[PDB]
Amino acid sequence: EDPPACGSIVPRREWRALASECRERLTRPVRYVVVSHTAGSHCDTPASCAQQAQNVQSYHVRNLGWCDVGYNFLIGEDGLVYEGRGWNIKGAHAGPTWNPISIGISFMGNYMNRVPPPRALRAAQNLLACGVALGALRSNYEVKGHRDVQPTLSPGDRLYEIIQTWSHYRA
Amino acid sequence: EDPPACGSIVPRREWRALASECRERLTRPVRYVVVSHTAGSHCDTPASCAQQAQNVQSYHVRNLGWCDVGYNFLIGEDGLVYEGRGWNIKGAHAGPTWNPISIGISFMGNYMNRVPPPRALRAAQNLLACGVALGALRSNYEVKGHRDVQPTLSPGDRLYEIIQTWSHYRA
Amino acid sequence: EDPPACGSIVPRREWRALASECRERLTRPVRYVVVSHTAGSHCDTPASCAQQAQNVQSYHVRNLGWCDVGYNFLIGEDGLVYEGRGWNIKGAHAGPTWNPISIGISFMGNYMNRVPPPRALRAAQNLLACGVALGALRSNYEVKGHRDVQPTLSPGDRLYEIIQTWSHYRA
Amino acid sequence: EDPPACGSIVPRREWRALASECRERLTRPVRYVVVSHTAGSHCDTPASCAQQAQNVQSYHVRNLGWCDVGYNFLIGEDGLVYEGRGWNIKGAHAGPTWNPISIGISFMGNYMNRVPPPRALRAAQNLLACGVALGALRSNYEVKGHRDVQPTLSPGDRLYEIIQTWSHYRA
Ligand SMILES: CC(=O)N[C@@H]1[C@@H](O)[C@H](O)[C@@H](CO)O[C@H]1O
Numbered sequence: 023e024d025p026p027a028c029g030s031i032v033p034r035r036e037w038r039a040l041a042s043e044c045r046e047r048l049t050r051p052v053r054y055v056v057v058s059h060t061a062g063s064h065c066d067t068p069a070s071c072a073q074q075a076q077n078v079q080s081y082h083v084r085n086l087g088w089c090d091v092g093y094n095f096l097i098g099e100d101g102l103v104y105e106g107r108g109w110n111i112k113g114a115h116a117g118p119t120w121n122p123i124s125i126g127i128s129f130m131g132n133y134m135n136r137v138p139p140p141r142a143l144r145a146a147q148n149l150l151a152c153g154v155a156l157g158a159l160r161s162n163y164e165v166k167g168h169r170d171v172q173p174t175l176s177p178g179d180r181l182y183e184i185i186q187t188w189s190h191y192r193a
Numbered sequence: 194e195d196p197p198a199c200g201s202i203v204p205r206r207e208w209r210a211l212a213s214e215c216r217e218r219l220t221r222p223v224r225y226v227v228v229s230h231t232a233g234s235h236c237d238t239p240a241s242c243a244q245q246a247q248n249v250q251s252y253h254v255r256n257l258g259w260c261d262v263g264y265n266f267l268i269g270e271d272g273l274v275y276e277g278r279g280w281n282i283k284g285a286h287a288g289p290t291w292n293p294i295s296i297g298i299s300f301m302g303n304y305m306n307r308v309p310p311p312r313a314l315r316a317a318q319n320l321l322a323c324g325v326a327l328g329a330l331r332s333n334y335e336v337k338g339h340r341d342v343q344p345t346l347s348p349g350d351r352l353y354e355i356i357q358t359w360s361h362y363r364a
Numbered sequence: 365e366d367p368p369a370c371g372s373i374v375p376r377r378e379w380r381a382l383a384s385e386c387r388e389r390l391t392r393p394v395r396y397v398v399v400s401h402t403a404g405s406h407c408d409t410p411a412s413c414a415q416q417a418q419n420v421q422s423y424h425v426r427n428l429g430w431c432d433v434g435y436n437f438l439i440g441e442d443g444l445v446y447e448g449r450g451w452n453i454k455g456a457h458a459g460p461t462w463n464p465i466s467i468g469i470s471f472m473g474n475y476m477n478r479v480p481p482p483r484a485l486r487a488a489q490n491l492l493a494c495g496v497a498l499g500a501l502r503s504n505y506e507v508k509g510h511r512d513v514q515p516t517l518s519p520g521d522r523l524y525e526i527i528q529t530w531s532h533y534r535a
Numbered sequence: 536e537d538p539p540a541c542g543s544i545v546p547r548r549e550w551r552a553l554a555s556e557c558r559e560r561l562t563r564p565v566r567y568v569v570v571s572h573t574a575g576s577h578c579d580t581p582a583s584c585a586q587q588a589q590n591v592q593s594y595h596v597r598n599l600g601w602c603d604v605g606y607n608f609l610i611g612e613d614g615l616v617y618e619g620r621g622w623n624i625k626g627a628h629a630g631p632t633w634n635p636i637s638i639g640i641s642f643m644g645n646y647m648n649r650v651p652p653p654r655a656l657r658a659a660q661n662l663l664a665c666g667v668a669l670g671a672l673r674s675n676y677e678v679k680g681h682r683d684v685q686p687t688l689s690p691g692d693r694l695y696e697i698i699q700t701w702s703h704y705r706a
Contacts, residue, residue, distance in 0.1 A: 023360070025566075025673075027322040029200045030272065030315050067238040068272055068312060101201070101239060102272055102312070141203065141239060141273070148201035155198050157675070224385055224431065294385065333429050333632055360635070364388060364464075403688050424686060434686060460631050515595060515605060516687065517574050 028152035029145070031095070031103045037072040039079055039105075044089035046112040046122075051160045054124035055150065056116045057185055058168035059177040064099055064131030066139075071098035074130050079106075088114055093128040095149060101141030103149045109158035116171050124166075125153065133178030143184065150190075164192040199323035202266070203275045208243035210250055210276075215260035217283045224331050225295035226321060227287045228356055229339035229347040235270055235302030237310075242269035245301050250277075259285050266298040266320060272312030274320050275301075280329040288343045295337075296330070304349030314355065321361075335363040368497035372490065373437075373445045379414040381421060381447075385431035388454040393502045396466035397492065398458045399527050400510035400518040406441045406473030408481075413440040416472050421448075430456060435470040437491060443483030445491050446472075451500040458513045466508075467495065475520025485526070492532070506534035541665040542658075544608075544616045550585040552618075553596055555603035559625040559635075564673040567637030568663065569629045570698050571681035572690040577612050577644030579652075584611030587643050601627060606641040608662060614654030616662050622671040629684050637679070638672065646691025656697065663703075677705040 024031075034042075060078055065071040075098075079091035092114040096104040106128075107113045115126030127146060129138055153159030167185055168176040170193055177185070185191055205213075231249055236242040246269075250262035263285040264277040278284045286297030298317060300309050324330035336359055339347035348356070356362055376384075402420050407413040417440075421433040434456040438446040448470075449455045457468030469488060471480050495501035507530055510518035519527065527533055547555075573591055578584035588611075592604040605627040609617040619641070620626050628639030640659060642651055666672035678701055681689035690698070698704055 023318065023322075027199050027319065027326040029323075030312065030319045032272075032312060036311060066240075069237070100271070101203075139239075140207065141201075144201045148197075148199075151198045291387075331429060402686075427683070428685065513599070515573075515599065 024152075026152075026155040028155060029103065029148045031105050031149070031152075032068075032072070034105050037075045037104055039075070039091070040083055042090040042107065042111070044107055044111045048110050048112050048122065050157060052123065052125055052158060053160050053163055054120070055153075055159070055163060055165045055190075056120060056124045056126050056168055056171055057146075057165060057177050057181075058093070058115060058126060058128045059133045059181055060096070060128050060130050061132050061176060061178075062130060064136070066099040068098075068100050068102060071100045071102060071104065071130065074098070075104045078130070093126040095125070095127045097127060097129045097142050097146055097149075099131065099139050099142050101139065101145050103145050109153070109156065116168065120171050125159065129177060129181060133181030134175060135180055136178070137180045137184070163190060165190045166193065167191075197323075197327075199326050200274070200319045202320070203239075203243065203273050205276050208246045208275055210247065210262070211254055213261040213278070213282070215278060215282050219281055219283045219293070219296070221328070222331050223294065223296050223324075223329060224334060225291070226330070226334055226336045226361075227291060227295050227297045227339055227342055228317075228336060228352070229264075229286060229297060229299045229345075230304045230349045230352060231267070231299050231301050232303045232347065232349075233301065235307070237270045239271050239273060242271040242273060242275065242301065245269070246275045249301070263297070264299045265296045268298060268300045268309075268313055268317050268320070270302065270310050270313045272310070272316050274316050280324065280327065287339060291342050296324070300348065300352060304352035305346060306351060307349075308351040308355070318359070334361055336361045337363065368494065370494040370498060372487070373447050374410070374414070376447050379417045379446055381418070381433075382425055384449065384453070386449060386453050389452055390454050390464070390467070392452065392500050394465065394467050394495075394500060395502045395505055396462070397501070397505055397507045397532075398462060398466050398468045398510055398513055399507060399523070400435070400457060400468060400470045400516075401475045401520045401523060402438070402470055402472050403474045403518060403520075404472065406478075408441040410440075410442050410444060413442045413444065413446065413472065416440070417446045420472065424456075434468070436467045437469045439469060439471045439480075439484055439488050439491070441473060441480060441484050443481075443487050445487050451495065451498065458510060462513050467501070471519065471523060475523035476517060477522065478520075479522045479526065505532055507532045508534065540668050542616065542661050544618050544662070545581075545585065546618050550588045550617055552589070552592060552604070555620065555624070557602040557620055557624050560623055561625050561635065561638070563623065563671050565622075565636070565638050565666070565671060566673045566676055567633065567679060568672070568676055568703070569633060569637050569639050569679045569681055569684060570642070570659075570690050570694070571606070571628060571639060571687075572642045572644060572646045572694055573609075574645050574689065574691075575643065577649075579612045581613050581615060584613045584615060584617065584643060587611070588617045591643065595627075606639045608638070608640045610640060610642045610651070610655050610659050610662075612644060612652050612655045614652070614658050616658050622666065622669070629681065633679075633684050638666065642690060642694060646694035647688065648693060649691070650693050650697065676703055678703045679705070
């Protein structure tokens, strides 16, 4: 079980993740959440999203040489959250000024001119509520979009419009 | 206004349910939770799952002429929870004696000699955790099998065998 | 054919009991009776005792979040028996091992340094003869003190001292 | 690397315990702590508290037929902590709802109108800092008085008043 009402994260072992080798810790009460998109293939069933999670981590580990998938959590259009590096290990997703002070969540797919289903938007807001409840996220946490932090099109134009609608979105 | 720590649920509108004709209430803090299986087809994608939700509601409303789907919540093997009568409305799932005082959640499928996948079990447990967060369920709620309350094989041997290991299961 | 001498019992509705939420039945005939004391204050009138009964129910139901007062019957210093969960419903008075196979009667007060008057003692024994008549108790039932079954000072040094002299007492 | 910033606990062997026969385990980190008192006499020297611990134990084991002494740890007024079932094994101290999700620390003695001496409160508080340091307790663990989760006068009026002042006490 997980501490408080904390919404159905699919664990690493369930999507067949390679073992992590990342060691850097994340200071517990984190303030920021940077939302990005993978720019990869999109996904809408648990079978196909688990495979997509394997494909992303694979690229990050086998090819780029990283210690594990770059993001802290991945989200599928199947409307489920996939455990990446987690709440405790510093992720590699928004650059050296932002990786140690934020949580990186990534929507699997390319949302430049595609919008994610409400069930995926629901899963993320629910993952974020679990964040607070847990202590990993500061109650007054701010959500930034990848592009407000690094020069890039991520999280896609259409995904980007939505996150401004968000209660916690700053700047 | 605000707000749901709680968890993520596929709402009535999203799986295209007919409107509820129900108006009888469940007194605010609920004590018992009854677990059953639908004994119908199983499901593993948001698409097919939403379809089953309708087939089940359809059968309840059109054929048995109930005011709405009999369960408060339905669980899919796609790992999602589908909204039924919900937290406030009394359901029709376990007899005139247990319906006024419990929440009936049902797994879509027949678990007589088949087991539900980990993500479905995780969705159900998460759903209940959300229940006490809302104050809909007692912190000390009690889970019961459908067979413990009325003569039926529901929730199916394999699933019944599993829920007995649940922290809140009571004789 | 016709009736036994049972009813010197003050019914729930007479002492203003809150509605019960318990549903687990006892299998009759019951073999054991476990004697305890509330460790609280006493009462020697039907007036104050109906009060006392209400307060210990309020504790069990409001503070502890229990379906009902934990004892099957409560005995007054006024010589009257007060209905608790009664003969057919499992109480919550001596733990998971003993609750399903026994009836828990409790003397309202603290008998560590007081003996309960004869009329309280009389009330209790006549309650027992009764149980046998109705068929609720085995004719050869055994009485155990609360401290013989759980670590507590209940039923009180003096009353404990009193019950070990009883015909039906055992180990 | 040098166990462990933790505290000074008197092990079973040292107080001559009977071999535990307890097999059920707790899931670390534990979230709850229930403070109780033994309701017996106190002890104020390593010599006497060690024998008091055996007294408490033989009662739970010989008289009550339990696998081992019911508490996870016992606090003496000699200012020392006696190893009970410890951090990993499920205790038998507050019913089936709390035994599997809490650690039971018992103060040897009756505290209805006796306060424990500073060095006993200090030992209890130290033992808890210990439990967090080892990951046996959640850093935000909650403390509960015995009488807050079950019907008893435990931990005694005076001790009850003290613990309610604690940084970790919750309703
Ligand atoms: C055998 C047993 O433990 N029985 C339970 C008790 O634990 C519970 O707290 C109480 C109140 O709802 O109902 C009793 O039947």
